[PDB]
Amino acid sequence: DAGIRTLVMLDEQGEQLERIEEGMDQINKDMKEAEKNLTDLGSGGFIRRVTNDARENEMDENLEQVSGIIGNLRHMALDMGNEIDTQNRQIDRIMEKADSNKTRIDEANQRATKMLG
Amino acid sequence: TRHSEIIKLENSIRELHDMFMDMAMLVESQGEMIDRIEYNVEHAVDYVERAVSDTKKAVKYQS
Amino acid sequence: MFMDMAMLVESQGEMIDRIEYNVEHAVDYVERAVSDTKKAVKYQS
Amino acid sequence: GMDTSGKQAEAMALLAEAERKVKNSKIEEACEIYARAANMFKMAKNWSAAGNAFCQAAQLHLQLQSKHDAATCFVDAGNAFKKADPQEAINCLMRAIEIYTDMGRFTIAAKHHISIAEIYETELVDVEKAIAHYEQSADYYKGEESNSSANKCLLKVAGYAAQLEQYQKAIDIYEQVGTSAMDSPLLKYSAKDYFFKAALCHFCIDMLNAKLAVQKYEELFPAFSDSRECKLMKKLLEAHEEQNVDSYTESVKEYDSISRLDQWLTTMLLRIKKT
Amino acid sequence: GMDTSGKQAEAMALLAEAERKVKNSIEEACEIYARAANMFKMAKNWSAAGNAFCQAAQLHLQLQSKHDAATCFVDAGNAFKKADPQEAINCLMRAIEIYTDMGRFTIAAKHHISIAEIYETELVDVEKAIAHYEQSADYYKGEESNSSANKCLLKVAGYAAQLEQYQKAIDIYEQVGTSAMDSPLLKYSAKDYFFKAALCHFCIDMLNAKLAVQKYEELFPAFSDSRECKLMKKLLEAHEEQNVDSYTESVKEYDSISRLDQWLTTMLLRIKKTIQ
Amino acid sequence: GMDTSGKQAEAMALLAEAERKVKNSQSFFSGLFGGSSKIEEACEIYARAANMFKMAKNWSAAGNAFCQAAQLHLQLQSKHDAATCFVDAGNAFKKADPQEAINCLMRAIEIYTDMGRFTIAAKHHISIAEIYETELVDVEKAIAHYEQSADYYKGEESNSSANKCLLKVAGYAAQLEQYQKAIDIYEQVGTSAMDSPLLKYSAKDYFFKAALCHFCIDMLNAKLAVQKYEELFPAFSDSRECKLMKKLLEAHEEQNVDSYTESVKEYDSISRLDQWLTTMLLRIKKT
Structure with a gap:
């Protein structure tokens, strides 16, 4: 149960990461466009079973x-790792x-504060 | 049959241990990075808020 | 090891949510500022 | 392919138009149009000339009254040159790191130190330069309290030093990292591996002191006895005590049957066993 | 080497330049001070770098600036952390006050946790650390940070049981168990917390512990099936039998079954001492 | 402590100052036509007072101030700030009394959806549904809000979210003794998620639920549904669900309630049963 919950909430975190990436991309594009427009304004x-007895039998099955x-x-574990990799990359790029x-x-502000005087 | 099953179990356990260790260290590094970006974005939003407030007051004074 | 991992994963998730909230605030304010700038430039001209 | 030729022609035309416009206040527009031309050239995917144009635009920006933008252009040009002449990219990234340190952002400076060390070690064979860069990055990160990156750099340099036959530095770093991880509530699982690596590095120095080293490691962390690594180390020591080749060969074969050995441990085991 | 002397001389020159610039009477002075502090940082002279940072902070605060002043105060406190815990604590408290006035609860609570950590690690003072942890927990609970508040409360309860009365431990452990048991993911560990409370009841008297464990069993059916309640019942039988041998046998059997946290061992040693 | 008295006194004084400021604002506008500068300053004071009241744990005063600021800014032709203040007021009321939060969130939903912003409308719908569910047992409004949010997300193409809302809808419908909607939703979700890589592991679970949800109607249709699901997803035969369902059917075909009870007890003992699953097993046991 802990493994499954970790995986599902890791996927949720990845979705949130993608959402923030899209938001920041839009912010960057809008900021560049606005800055250019303002500049142009101017087994x-x-x-x-040696002992026989039931005690052995059940044991075996359990094992x-x-x-x-x-x-x-084993397989499950591998899967849970993979996603992290991609996420890590994003957490860097952003x-x-x-x-x-x-x-x-900041530079824009500086420029806006130097053209006047 | 004892050797095969025992060794298979040991191999699976060792692989799980190693991969869990590696991905735990990876998660630690990821946490550090995300904390850094958190503080960076907080500072950026604060500074842009201050700059826009300054711009508003300046333009209103001039107009 | 599993139980040790769990707490760090939970902390990372909650603070990811907090970072997302902060970014939502920032983007909303940026949109409002852009709208105000458009209003000012259009009406002044 | 038509795509590459078309993109190259378009980017060349844009760059020529930018040059004519600038040649004919004007500095900012010239830098902007040059950056646009550099981006178009990068889209054309000619790494050498794309990087050349980008660093030329970065130099023009340096001519303009701005610092951080110049550093961003420098790092972009270094990334572009990543697949080109290493020396120019290394120099540009060093200049960017100097600017960052002057500005006071130590985290990005250490990240760029790691990047330059990585490219130097992967592309060029000269190791000491990459080791010095990694040590500088580790020092910066330790000054900035970023333990993860500092530990990673220390582990990398210790592994290389073990590779360069400087076992004293490797064992010192491994012991330091092991005790640091043991003290912390987390990462204590790899302390056994760190102690095992330290014991392996010590073994190269001599044989008699190996017993004392393993006893010291045991009394420092009693749980280290339970690890299979300690059992393997003691078994290999006992086998080496007698000039018999079969015992340790069978032990290492069993360990391989348990866990797949990495290249570093394989070569280290071969080196120790050969003599 | 070249680095030490060169950086020290450059930093002294920058300090003199800033002093002369202010003597003429200002942002350039703050920039020079920040640069000089950076040079000092590269020279490994942690001491007196925080002083330069604080001087820059006051210089910028003089003109109503509060955000960058707060950041500079936080950085100066972090630098003083290794050089002097007291000055670091003072700077961090100043930053916390500024941010709380500005309403940044997350930063204030993180700084409070840092203050508690530095208090408990370098210096020897837990009550101030307990108060700092309580303040941070309340700040986080106001911001509905369940995990951070739970962690802070659990640490406070552990410390209180370690040195203070058992009432705080019982209350906090019961609250955390109530909060976690209903939750789906953490329910697995919920039992653990409850057990601690029961042990803390055994410190006062056996009857109180018996009533507490009965209440826990009634509230949580799975608590009945746990091996932990069985071990506690065996320990209760041993205590009512005034037989330390049974106590030791049960404790060693549990230790062989599972390793100890070294705190349960201390609590059990205290309990076994009073069997008489 | 000092917080209560001091913060309440200072906040009340600031609110009285704001009331006086707005009272004099009309006179100033009539006599001089100053503009909205005084109105904007009064709104800023209102927001500050709301913030302080929230800080001092006086949720009601903070919500009142937030509502006042929202209305005042709405009268100033700025819908976005009014909507944000209404959302803050809804949060404060949720902290104190969700009845006002309901209308605040509805106002925010209307304002946002007027422009066509589907994401915020869906989020507010889910918030209102959660407010209704946590306190009241008004399943009808909760299901309506969940369906509305699911439709909004479906129209927005944002996958991986509406499916959870549909699963909650199916669970509540099955709890309400209405199974057709739950069966359809569960089968659709399972079939859609089968093709996805990550969801595959979980898909089988849904099928089992459907079987239980498809077992109340009758034994013949339940057996046919079990066969169809196993054939369409042969791997479903590997999990314990198929064996458990077969044993339950074999026990129930001969009025042997003891065997069914023993199988249920064993399944619960191996792993604790969910409240919904246990309730459905008990309801089936009535037959």
Whole structure:
């Protein structure tokens, strides 16, 4: 259950990351356009049944069951990792863009404060 | 049959341990990066708010 | 290891939500400022 | 292909028009149009000339009264040259890093240090330069309290130093990182691996002191006994005590049957076992 | 080497330039001060860099600026963190006050948690750390940050049980268990929290612990099936039997079954000492 | 503590000053025609007072101030600021009394959807649905709001969100003893999600729900539905759901309630049963 919840909320976080990426792209384009306009304005078993008895039998089955689950878990684990990679990349790229936008506005402000005098 | 199953279980457990460690470190780095961008965007929004307020007051004084 | 991972994942998710909220505020204010600039430039001209 | 030729022709025409316009206040518009031409050329995907035009526009921007924009253009030009003459990109990125340090953004400076070290090590074979860049980045990150990147850089330099046969620095860094991870509530699972790597690095120095080193590691972290790595280390030590080749060969074969060995550990094991 | 002397001389020259510039009587002075502080930072002279940052902060605050002044104060406090915890605490408190006046609760709460961490790590003072954690928890709860508030409350309860009365531990653990048990993801661990409260009840008397565990079992049916309640019942039988051997046997059996947190061991040692 | 008295006193004084300012604003406009500068300053004071009242935990006063500011700015031909203030007032009322939050959120929805902004309208619809559900048992309004938000998201092409709303709708419809809508929604969602890579693992679960939701109607149709789902998704045969359903049908075909109870108890023991699943099992046991 913990694995499944981690995966689903990781997917949700990725969706949010994509949404913020789109928002920032639109912000950058709008800011550049506005700045330009303003500038232009100017396995069978596990226990050897040596003892027989039921105690061994159940044991064996349990192990097998666990093994199978673990098998599945193996594959599951791999999947849960993969998405993170892509997300990480985004979490890096965004930074670059963000900085530029901020820089742009600051420079614009500076320019707007130097043309007057 | 003992050796095959025991070794298979050990291999699966070791692979899970290694991959979980690697992806945990990756998650830690991701968290650091997202915290940095959080502070960066907070500062950017604050500064743009201040700049637009200054522009508004200046233009209203001039007009 | 799983339970150790869980808390960091939860913290990252909540602060991702907070960052998204901040960005929504910023984009809404930017849109309002752009609209005000358009109004000013169009009416002054 | 028609696409590449058409895009190249369009970008050349745009760049020529920009040159004519600038040659004929004007600095800002010239820089803007040059940046547009550089972006179009990049879309044309001619890396060398695209980067050339971009750095020329960056120099023109430097002529203009602006600093951060020049640094952004410099980093973009370095990324463009990434697939071209390494020296020019390295110099441009060094200049950008100097500007960043002057401005005070240490995080981006360390990121660019890591990028330049990565390109130097991947493209060129000269390692010491990349190691120095990584050490500078680690120092900057430690000054900025960013433990993750500092630890990554320290691990990379320690691994290389082990590769360069400077085992003392490698073991020192590995022990430091292991104790740091152990102290922290998290990452304590890799402390056993760090101690095992430190023991392997120490073994190269001599054989008798290996027993003392492993005993010290055990008494420092008792749980390290439970790890299969400690069992493997002690078994290999006992096998090496006698000049028998079969014992450690079988042990390493079993370990490979358990876990797939990375290139560094494989070469290290071969080196230690050969002598 | 060249770096030390060169950077130190350049920083001193910048400080003198800023002093002369202000003596003429201003933003250029603040920029020079910030640059000089940066040079000092590269020279590894952590001390007196925070002083330059604070001087720049006051110079910029003189002209009504508050945001950049707050950021400079925070940076100066972070720099002083290693050099001097006291000055770092003062700068961080100033930044927290400024932001709270401006209404930035997230930054204020993060700074409060940082203050608590520095108080508890370098210096020896938990009550001030407890108050800082409580303030941060209240700030986060106001902003409906469930996980941060829960973590802060859990740490406060742990500290209170460690040194203070058990009432705080019982209250906070019960509240956290109530908040988490209903939640789907965390319910698995919910049991754990409850158990702690029960143990803290055993510190006062056995009857209170018995009533608390009965109430927990009635409220949470799964708490009945847990091995932890079985172990607590066995420990209760041992205590009413005044038999320390049974206590030790049960504790060692549990330790073999699962490892300990080293806090449960301390609590159980305290409980076994009073068996008499 | 000092917070209560001090903040209340200062906020009340500031609010009285704002009331005096707005009272004198009409006289100033009539006598001199100053403009909206005084109105804007009064609105800023209103927003500040609302913020302080929210800080001092006096949610009612903060909501009142937010509503006053929203109305005053709406009269100033600025719908966006009025909508934002109305959303803030709705949040404050939700903190104190959601009845006013309902109308505030409806006003925000109307204002936003007038321009065609579907995302904000859907989000506000989901917020109102949550407000209704958490306090009241008014399933009708909740289902209507969920369906409206799902339609808005479907028209906006934003996938991966409306499916959860449809799943909630199906669950509530099944809880209301209405199964056709729930069965249709669950089968559609499962079939659509089968093709997706990530959702595959979960798809089977939906089918099982449908089977249960398709078992109340009759045994013949339930058996046919189980067969159809297994054939369309043969991998569904690997999970425990098929074995459990087969055992339940075999036990129920002969009026052996004890075997059905034993199977249900074993399934619950291996993993705790959901409240909805347990309720449906109990309801089926009535037969």
